[PDB]
Design a protein around this ligand. Structure first.
Ligand SMILES: *[C@H](O)[C@H](C[C@@H]1CCNC1=O)NC(=O)[C@H](Cc1ccccc1)NC(=O)[C@@H](NC(=O)OCc1ccccc1)C(C)C
Ligand SMILES: *[C@H](O)[C@H](C[C@@H]1CCNC1=O)NC(=O)[C@H](Cc1ccccc1)NC(=O)[C@@H](NC(=O)OCc1ccccc1)C(C)C
Lengths: 306, 306
């Protein structure tokens, strides 16, 4: 029993974290096979960042201008290219610790773990969600760029996020591992707007199910509601619209708890309309939306990986 | 910027997780050098658990009754002993992945990461605190026993916790790695009381400092207070008494933020007396006490490990 924001074991990802230096700037890179991936703004000076022309800047660089250090040992860069907002450094030595991996572009509302890194060394690991507005609420200081987000499926690492920048919000933006940004963001130090975030309704319901599985049932109410009546309430509270695909995804939790999804929405509706009255659910005084139905199921069935 | 409940990278600990079977029961073990550690209740049948005599039960066992599996590969058990509530299995092969380690018995209020395991395979990793009443608020299902808590200092793993049992509370109890329980608990399936928990005042203040470092300053008030006046307020709210040793520990955060510790207590006092009024601090609608001053400092300076 118990329910915790839990991240995947980071060991498989730790072994791929390298330090990338080009000019004065140093950031983290991902070493898979004989390719090291990192944000292309590593080739930027502080003044370049205000308005960079990445083609022109990169043309000034050659292979030897890229310092790639894996702990103590050294990659010889024998090829470099820019794919979207990522730099790909071809090295002469495949990482002997390369795990089974795939590059995945996740959907808003999905979750993944972040292995925060500085100078190519892991600092810490934490879960979060791709917000509906394609930002993440992370913990990132200077030199954290190139730190990656990932999920594990038994033995395969799915890389889904590479960190590039912090917005004027304390929120974070970045790319998938083909270097395409999540959201409308560009890698330029210029004012940029995330847009209205919304709460991931299907994650909230899955978390309400997690609560009932762990004895927290006080919010379970006498009522039910309709999919359209609840979506009216949801739009008032900047909750994303619940669909039938979401209902189907909550099916297993529904079957485990013997609580219909629409009975759960009705509890959720009275929580949105009356608040929590100073109560807590799973140790939180707010509605939590960074657990997917899969997150919940996995933590209350005990799926492991290696 | 940003502030997240962050756990240590688990890679070094993943490499020590083995599966231990004795009779029908299977749990996790910690493989360091040529010794595998695990809870002694692995030798218990479900009926033994109600009132076990561990000496008598263990005498019925020999080395070959212990099945230790490291992924696919196999330890030959060549010696077993009971140290307090832990079983020590001598195996013929030292773990080639043994990291620099030490066994540490932590203090209430300190934090550590948990690598939750099932059948010797890591499932997930999360932070928490040893409560003042020597329980942890974890996430543990059946087969999680033997999962360990730890901290890392550069390259040295300090093991501090091994999971043994869940209480009638959904809270968790366990031992250090010499097999001494944290708290008054015994490894017997019999009703057991944790006692009144309290909030870790020094962790709360460190988190308030974390808030100010990240722009959340609304709680900063016009007032100051005295160490004894604040401790009066603290005792009313089941907060642990703030001491000068705690003040000295908060010194660096004090110097970084230019906010005196007692000015912070005065903010804390008005938060305890008037609540948060529906506001949040660092994305929480409750006062958070599972970050030590060290946790805060480390996340806002970027210390790394390997
Ligand atoms: C990489 O190590 C670093 C990590 C940052 C620092 C603190 N938290 C983080 O996530 N990232 C950066 O320094 C990038 C550098 C960059 C260079 C060239 C192109 C793009 C990015 N910059 C930022 O994260 C900065 N954010 C923005 O510039 O975002 C747009 C913006 C918003 C308001 C005003 C101007 C520009 C950040 C403010 C340091
Ligand atoms: C080990 O894999 C397992 C993990 C448990 C299951 C779910 N969450 C957990 O942390 N732990 C156990 O099953 C232990 C087994 C045990 C056997 C012999 C001696 C001690 C423990 N048992 C428990 O965690 C149970 N908790 C208690 O028995 O605690 C005292 C108590 C409280 C109320 C009523 C009777 C006894 C737990 C209730 C399964």
């Amino acid at each position: 029993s118990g329910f915790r924001k839990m991240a995947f074991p980071s060991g498989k990802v730790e072994g791929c974290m390298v330090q990338v230096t080009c000019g004065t700037t140093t950031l983290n890179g991902l070493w898979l096979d004989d390719v090291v991936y990192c944000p292309r703004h590593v080739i930027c000076t502080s003044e370049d960042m205000l308005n960079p022309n990445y083609e022109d800047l990169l043309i000034r660089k050659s292979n030897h201008n890229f310092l790639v250090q894996a702990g103590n040992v050294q990659l010889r860069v024998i090829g470099h290219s820019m794919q979207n907002c990522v730099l790909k450094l071809k090295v002469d030595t495949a990482n002997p610790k390369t795990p089974k991996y795939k590059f995945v572009r996740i959907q808003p509302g999905q979750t993944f773990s972040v292995l925060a890194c500085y100078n190519g060394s892991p600092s810490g690991v934490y879960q979060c969600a791709m917000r509906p507005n394609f930002t993440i609420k992370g913990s990132f200081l200077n030199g954290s760029c190139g730190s990656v987000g990932f999920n594990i499926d038994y033995d395969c690492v799915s890389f889904c996020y590479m960190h590039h920048m912090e917005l004027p919000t304390g929120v974070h933006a970045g790319t998938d591992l083909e270097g395409n940004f999540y959201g409308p963001f560009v890698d330029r130090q210029t004012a940029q707007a995330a847009g209205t975030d919304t709460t991931i309704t299907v994650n909230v319901l899955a978390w309400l199910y997690a609560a009932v599985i762990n004895g927290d049932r006080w919010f379970l109410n006498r009522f039910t509601t309709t999919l359209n009546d609840f979506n009216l309430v949801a739009m008032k509270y900047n909750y994303e619209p619940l669909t039938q695909d979401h209902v189907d995804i909550l099916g297993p939790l529904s079957a485990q708890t013997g609580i219909a999804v629409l009975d759960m929405c009705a509890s959720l509706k009275e929580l949105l309309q009356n608040g929590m009255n100073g109560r807590t659910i799973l140790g939180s005084a707010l509605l939590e939306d960074e657990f997917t139905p899969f997150d919940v199921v996995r933590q209350c069935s005990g799926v492991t990986f290696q």
